[PDB]
Amino acid sequence: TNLCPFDEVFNATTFASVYAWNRKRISNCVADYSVLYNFAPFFAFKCYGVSPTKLNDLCFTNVYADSFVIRGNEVSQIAPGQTGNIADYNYKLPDDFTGCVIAWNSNKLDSKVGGNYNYRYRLFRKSNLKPFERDISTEIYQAGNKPCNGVAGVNCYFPLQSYGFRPTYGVGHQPYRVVVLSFELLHAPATVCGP
Amino acid sequence: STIEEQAKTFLDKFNHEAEDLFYQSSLASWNYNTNITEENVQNMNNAGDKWSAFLKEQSTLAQMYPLQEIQNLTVKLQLQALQQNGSSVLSEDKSKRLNTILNTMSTIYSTGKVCNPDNPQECLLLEPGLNEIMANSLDYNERLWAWESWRSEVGKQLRPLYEEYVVLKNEMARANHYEDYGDYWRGDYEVNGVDGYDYSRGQLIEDVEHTFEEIKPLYEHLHAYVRAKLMNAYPSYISPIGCLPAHLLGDMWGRFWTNLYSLTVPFGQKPNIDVTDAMVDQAWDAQRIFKEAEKFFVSVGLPNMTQGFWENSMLTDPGNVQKAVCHPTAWDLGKGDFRILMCTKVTMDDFLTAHHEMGHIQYDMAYAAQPFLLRNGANEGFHEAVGEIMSLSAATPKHLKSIGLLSPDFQEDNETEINFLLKQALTIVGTLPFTYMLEKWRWMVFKGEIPKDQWMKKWWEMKREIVGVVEPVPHDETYCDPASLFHVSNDYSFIRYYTRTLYQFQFQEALCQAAKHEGPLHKCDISNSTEAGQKLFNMLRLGKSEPWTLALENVVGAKNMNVRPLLNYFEPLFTWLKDQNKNSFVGWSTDWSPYA
Ligand SMILES: *[C@@H]1O[C@H](CO)[C@@H](O[C@@H]2O[C@H](CO)[C@@H](O)[C@H](O)[C@H]2NC(C)=O)[C@H](O)[C@H]1NC(C)=O
Ligand SMILES: *[C@@H]1O[C@H](CO)[C@@H](O)[C@H](O)[C@H]1NC(C)=O
Ligand SMILES: *[C@@H]1O[C@H](CO)[C@@H](O)[C@H](O)[C@H]1NC(C)=O
Ligand SMILES: *[C@@H]1O[C@H](CO)[C@@H](O)[C@H](O)[C@H]1NC(C)=O
Ligand SMILES: [Zn+2]
């Protein structure tokens, strides 16, 4: 009946760090996927399991608009069966992922000539991320064999690094505002519909 | 958790912090060089002091991961380059003396001035007061004045400093386990742990001398031919079997003979190819110059210039009030930001240099995937030679004809090719004995073979025997004539210029063979050859992650530096020189002197 708050996930003033990927569970509203274009310099719309062409034909039990920021090089990592710092330790997608990936260059917003250190990723983690997990833990990461005692230092590196998006950066290092649209499909009434 | 895995993680944190800080140091240096003001000066000092302090810190945390227990050569190469101590190994007092002497010498040279003898009010800096006399004047005593005064005013002051410079630089090397400072400098070419591609530091001296042996006959003919023409323009002064006086060589020292083209041109009636005038008629600007350069690299299969490159680079002098350092430089700031700072005029020289500096950018873009510590040329001599081969192809009559700067009605005869080759040989071949002898003298000074009271005596002995160049005025051991050159009194290794020369002709000969060029090597244009660009690229993308010997083999098919392509390029001039020197003496004598 009411419009799904895609304006929220796709036009929010601030998105998220990828390590704390923010999900807006979508339900009982009307989905109008054609609106999804903000006239951005580098737009990607890969979809898996579902068909992006005429995406406003399929009901789902839920839609999970996971939003974050990463640099351009790592955008490809937001995809099934990928590897690298993002998908390994920050935000993994499953093998048979059934949804969509929508990213766009945001150097206009999230860069600063002094450097925007607000957006973080997770440089080290002890075990690879099970699909759609989130590790918001600041556990001082023990790389060596002596316990780290919750204080950083030798082989005790802090597990989160900043990006420092400056505007003079390159396309593969500029901030890119990713929006995953995980389409859940359970036995439930599947209230997420709409042409 | 082994120690190789701790080093693997230590380098991972480093690679992300180092990329961030080096980006601030590069962007602070870029803002200074593009806008020079006293406020920009201050920030280049701050970011450059934070980056110098972060590197200094990280080295100590790295010495805890022993290189022996690390087996992945990529990790070893990063730690080895990070574990460098340098000045640090010296006491906090000696590490402060050395930094003072290096600062004082660099200021004595750059600010070094000599004033007219007749007019003690009129003084001249080396650039552009004395360098201007050396290049363009054709008097004898006016050249002898500037050549002597520079070495007697600037050089004599540097002499006590260079003696202490040698002593401390050795103690730095002997505490990083090198034999001497020269051995420390030769560590740039060293390779260990890769069987079949290893390269010892001592091997460089064998290579450099053995290769220079093959250069000798060409140089002896270029020297004899140059001497004969010089003997006809300075009749009473130059002997037909003696060395060339050091001040008649085109510049302050004789590093390049390029300025002697006016007096040595074989067929001075036939003009030189100067597309400068054609660029003005077609309304070319700097935008077009780099676009035509960007076109050249696309044609061989290399990627176009980054969108940031056009937005942030400085392709013209901003002029007016915003001043800048106009020395052409390519900037790899990192994080995808590439930039060229060139005060371009619409001339042919800048057209070719834009190709040369953009070659540096293409090299930098290529290995941009590599880890931070491995983003560099395979050795020192790679990076310059990758840019030089760009200006080799771009300046050919073929490329000029294919871009519409040279009309297809212009015809190349065997005489303009001889004019072309000789102007190259004055620049290229002429610097090889100068470069090899200078780095030989410094190498022998550091090893201790030349005592202090024989410094200037062994210098001018070796200048006669190797370079075939004689001083016009005798010098005692209060001079330091090497120190009168920038690269000597400013602590820069010099053999890179010899190795770079031989590298570039190895590349160009290999790239043209892949491009199926037919004819002499000096006529070749690698344009449109994607096979050539591919061959070059698979070395460009390696960076420092491979031994330079493997990098050299991925282009030219040989593991070692060779001189034959250099000879092959210059052969048409060589057999012609063997003709013009038919009834002239080939060789020189080391005991003649214009000072009796
Ligand atoms: C740089 O200096 C460090 C510190 O001096 C060197 O590492 C030390 O070497 C001494 C040699 O007597 C050992 O006793 C120490 O255990 C070492 N470690 C530390 C933390 O001091 C390091 O070898 C030097 N690097 C190079 C390349 O010379
Ligand atoms: C999203 O925000 C931009 C900038 O504020 C605005 O131009 C655009 O109209 C917005 N789009 C929607 C659908 O609200
Ligand atoms: C060394 O490390 C790199 C990067 O992790 C890896 O690709 C390479 O395979 C390693 N070396 C060997 C011999 O496997
Ligand atoms: C660059 O130099 C000019 C001098 O004309 C100065 O006015 C300007 O402020 C400088 N740039 C910046 C970003 O301040
Ligand atoms: Zn260069």
Protein architecture, described:
Chain B: It catalyses: angiotensin II + H2O = angiotensin-(1-7) + L-phenylalanine; angiotensin I + H2O = angiotensin-(1-9) + L-leucine; bradykinin(1-8) + H2O = bradykinin(1-7) + L-phenylalanine; neurotensin + H2O = neurotensin-(1-12) + L-leucine. The complex is a heterodimer of chains A (195) and B (596). Chain A is mainly beta and 195 residues long. Helices cover 8% and strands 21% of the residues of chain A. Chain A is globular and about 55 Å long. Chain B is mainly α and 596 residues long. Among the domains of chain B are: 79 residues; 68 residues, no CATH class; 117 residues, no CATH class. Chain B is 58% helix and 4% strand. At the A-B interface, loops of A face helix 1 and helix 12 of B.
Query: What spatial form of chain A do the alpha-carbon principal axes imply?
Result: globular
The SS-based structural class of chain A is mainly beta
Rounded to the nearest angstrom, the radius of gyration of chain A is 18 Å
How far is the first residue's CA from the last residue's CA of chain B? Answer: 74 Å
**Greatest chain-chain contact:** A-B, 19 and 23 residues
The total domain count of chain A is 1
Please identify the oligomeric state: heterodimer
The set of bound ligands, ions and cofactors reads: a molecule of 2 linked components (NAG-NAG), 2-acetamido-2-deoxy-beta-D-glucopyranose, zinc ion
Which radius of gyration of chain B do the C-alpha atoms yield?
A: 25 Å
